[PDB]
Amino acid sequence: HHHMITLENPDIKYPLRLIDKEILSHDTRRFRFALPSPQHILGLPIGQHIYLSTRIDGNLVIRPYTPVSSDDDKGFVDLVVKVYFKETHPKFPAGGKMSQYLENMNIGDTIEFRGPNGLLVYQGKGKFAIRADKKSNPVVRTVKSVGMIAGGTGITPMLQVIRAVLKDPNDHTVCYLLFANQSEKDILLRPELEELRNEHSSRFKLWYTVDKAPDAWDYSQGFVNEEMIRDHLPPPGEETLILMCGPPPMIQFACLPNLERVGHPKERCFTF
Ligand SMILES: Cc1cc2nc3c(=O)[nH]c(=O)nc-3n(C[C@H](O)[C@H](O)[C@H](O)COP(=O)(O)OP(=O)(O)OC[C@H]3O[C@@H](n4cnc5c(N)ncnc54)[C@H](O)[C@@H]3O)c2cc1C
Numbered sequence: 001h002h003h004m005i006t007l008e009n010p011d012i013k014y015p016l017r018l019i020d021k022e023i024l025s026h027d028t029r030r031f032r033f034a035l036p037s038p039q040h041i042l043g044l045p046i047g048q049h050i051y052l053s054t055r056i057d058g059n060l061v062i063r064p065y066t067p068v069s070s071d072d073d074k075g076f077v078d079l080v081v082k083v084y085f086k087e088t089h090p091k092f093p094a095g096g097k098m099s100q101y102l103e104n105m106n107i108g109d110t111i112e113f114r115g116p117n118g119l120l121v122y123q124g125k126g127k128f129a130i131r132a133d134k135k136s137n138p139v140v141r142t143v144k145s146v147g148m149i150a151g152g153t154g155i156t157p158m159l160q161v162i163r164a165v166l167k168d169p170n171d172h173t174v175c176y177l178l179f180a181n182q183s184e185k186d187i188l189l190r191p192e193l194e195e196l197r198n199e200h201s202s203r204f205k206l207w208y209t210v211d212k213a214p215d216a217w218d219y220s221q222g223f224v225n226e227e228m229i230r231d232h233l234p235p236p237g238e239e240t241l242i243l244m245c246g247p248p249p250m251i252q253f254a255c256l257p258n259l260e261r262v263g264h265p266k267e268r269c270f271t272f
């Protein structure tokens with residue numbers, strides 16, 4: 001390890017203290033935890049994520065999260081989370097476990113962090129180091145365009161990649177994002193994504209689709225489909241890699257068959 005990082009060993013659990021919280025909307029939040037010292041950094045390679053774990057209602061609960069903060073930040077790590085409240089959705093009366101546990105924490109409480117984890121690591125300048133599985137070494141490839149499909153919270157893994165690309169004035173990679181949500185109010189991190197579209201149009205393309213569309217809507221309506229893929233993601237080729245992260249039903253039924261129809265082979269599709 002070159003830098004003073006927090007995640008020194010992936011097999012270890014690190015209890016971090018919650019030092020701040022922001023209410024972004026009725027059900028979305030920003031949670032900030034302190035690192036071991038104000039001079040530490042998290043130590044999360046781009047393309048990877050961490051897991052939070054704790055005991056809820058007598059069981060061990062583990063969940064993956066991709067921070068919105070980065071290794072440029074000293075002393076803290078920020079998570080942006082959607083809270084799934086109980087007795088709200090008729091189909092899931094109990095709500096979300098880790099998300100509600102987070103919402104119920106008091107400043108000063110701690111929770112365990114672990115990482116980094118993930119088969120994909122972006123090495124910058126278009127280079128992607130990928131492991132077929134955990135027991136293999138990574139195969140490196142260089143692309144010029146990265147298509148990105150996100151549904152719901154699957155957006156944070158894309159935002160981490162997007163910011164890494166744009167912060168490097170010498171990185172010429174172009175990112176294409178197709179962001180899908182239930183409704184306009186559910187478009188997580190819209191301000192941050194739009195600020196980035198503002199400052200780096202040449203390297204960042206952005207498009208949205210929502211299940212229920214308001215009357216004033218300039219984007220798409222409906223699940224991701226063939227047409228959206230063709231119109232908002234880069235065209236198939238060795239120079240193109242497609243990234244995905246969202247609900248299982250989205251990846252299995254709306255993305256793969258259509259990506260296949262359009263011509264993006266599975267060896268160029270990665271699912272976070
Ligand atoms: C690589 C990666 C990175 C991730 N990064 C982030 C991130 O930055 N931020 C983030 O918030 N999540 C992120 N997630 C996903 C997130 O970890 C889980 O979806 C989330 O925390 C679910 O946990 P839970 O314990 O709260 O709910 P569980 O108890 O896992 O899940 C509840 C299940 O029921 C449904 N459900 C329950 N209650 C409701 C309700 N009130 N309304 C609607 N549907 C409901 C949900 O759809 C889900 O299927 C990431 C996932 C991956 C794979």
Ligand SMILES: NC(=O)c1ccc[n+]([C@@H]2O[C@@H](COP(=O)([O-])OP(=O)(O)OC[C@H]3O[C@@H](n4cnc5c(N)ncnc54)[C@H](O)[C@@H]3O)[C@H](O)[C@@H]2O)c1
Pocket residue numbers: 082151152153154155180181182183186210211222223224245246247248249250251253254
């Ligand atoms: N891929 C996995 O194996 C896996 C496992 C656990 C959790 N997740 C989670 O899924 C993402 C889900 O976020 P969320 O629950 O707030 O999303 P959400 O339910 O609010 O929105 C999901 C979006 O995906 C699409 N979608 C949902 N169901 C679909 C279906 N049946 N067919 C086609 N498209 C569909 C729609 O465009 C929708 O707007 C999380 O970030 C995390 O990755 C994924």
